[PDB]
Nucleic acid binder design. Structure first.
Ligand SMILES: [Ca+2]
Ligand SMILES: [Ca+2]
Lengths: 233, 236
DNA sequence: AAAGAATCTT
DNA sequence: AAAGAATCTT
């Protein structure tokens, strides 16, 4: 299974290799920072070749966005199964945890908005989630093991987005779907709040931007289900 | 001075080294992406040791933010004169073959002395911007012996150190994220400091009173000329 | 252009 | 929670 092999490959790479700096062609090494801004960029680069290997192993073509502001990080597809593409997106958080699962105002409400391929052709939306416990000169190659690593214990999971999605927004002005606020294992096990991928889509598709507005609609799943029960009114 | 030395230091470092990938303690190397989110991070990390080096050469303590949404990237100051701190922020943008930068938020520390800033805004006497401009240029991993084989994610890169106010423009750099926009000019004007403001006082006031949407400022000011007219009218 | 896409803090 | 802080595309 692509998914089976991918998570095993990622889980394995994570376990066997520790990123500790950026290197120049001339061999000079610059240490890393402890900002998620830095580490998220790192975790994506660390993931790229592994995703590529497993995909090719399964006959999948991997495409990355051409222009920025486009989802997802990696689009996987067989030329024979063009309308059954799978979306893989890298997400990071640090230390219960929570992730911002992308916007609810672009591709989920508009088939072609801010997405490499029309939302139509994807049959799966996976999230490779990384969590790290947060913890000034250069080094030569001969010092790789001496460079202080900017994190304590990174963990990685592979889950379906709809399965780890929560009912509360992940961000305000940038309108992101928020994930469940739970322990790492709950992500691996897929202990979400939605009963189906459809309920997930419907919910974030009609979620109002501010609590002012969703005060008169729904602010959580229970209220959403009541809103559903009465006739979406 | 610290400023000249730093600028000299940055130029020389950028000339001598080409960042090409991330390296593991085990020696495996993962290539770099060619997207500015990746490159911004890289360039920031590349600058840190040089900045720290020179600062130390001048007697300055370098402090980075303890929290994430906090300006600036680096705060330099002598412990003898803590009220005279220097803010240094790393900015990045790209060219395909005139450029522009997003110079920071206009609703945070500039309007509130302690909002989203490491130290109260009033303790900084200078706000420097180290700007990187790369001309936009693998899927495998490498070993330490293959460094010359790893693809460089940029065709070229230039760096400048300039006063934030000097390069600021009158049009916003971002909408929802309310960022100050820089001048839309050729790299040389950034180095030359050919801005639009008469002084830093005018720069600060313009951004402290800039309305976030067209409608709002439509009845105030959209550009420098209109701002100057707004001043004439009595800040009305 | 101006507006709005692309994880964290109080 | 909430809401708003932290380069790109049209
Ligand atoms: Ca990406
Ligand atoms: Ca991502």
């Amino acid at each position: 299974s692509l998914r089976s092999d991918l998570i095993n490959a990622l889980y394995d790479e994570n376990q066997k290799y520790d990123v500790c700096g950026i290197i120049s062609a001339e061999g000079k090494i610059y240490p890393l920072g402890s900002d998620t801004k830095v580490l998220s960029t790192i975790f994506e680069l660390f993931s790229r070749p592994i995703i590529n290997k497993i995909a090719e192993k399964h006959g999948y073509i991997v495409e990355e966005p051409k222009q920025q502001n486009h989802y997802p990080d990696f689009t996987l597809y067989k030329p024979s199964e063009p309308n059954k593409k799978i979306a893989i997106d890298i997400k990071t958080t640090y230390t219960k945890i929570k992730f911002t699962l992308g916007g609810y105002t672009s591709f989920i409400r508009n088939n072609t908005k801010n997405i490499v391929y029309p939302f139509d052709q994807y049959i799966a939306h996976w999230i490779i989630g990384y969590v790290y416990t947060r913890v000034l000169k250069t080094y030569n190659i001969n010092e790789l093991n001496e460079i202080p690593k900017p994190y304590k214990g990174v963990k990685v999971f592979l889950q379906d987005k709809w399965v780890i999605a929560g009912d509360l927004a992940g961000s305000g002005n940038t309108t992101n779907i928020g994930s469940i606020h739970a322990h790492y294992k709950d992500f691996v096990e897929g202990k979400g709040i939605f009963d189906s991928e459809d309920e997930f889509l419907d919910y974030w598709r009609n979620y109002e931007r501010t609590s002012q507005l969703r005060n008169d609609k729904y602010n959580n799943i229970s209220e959403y289900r009541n809103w559903i029960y009465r006739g979406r009114k």
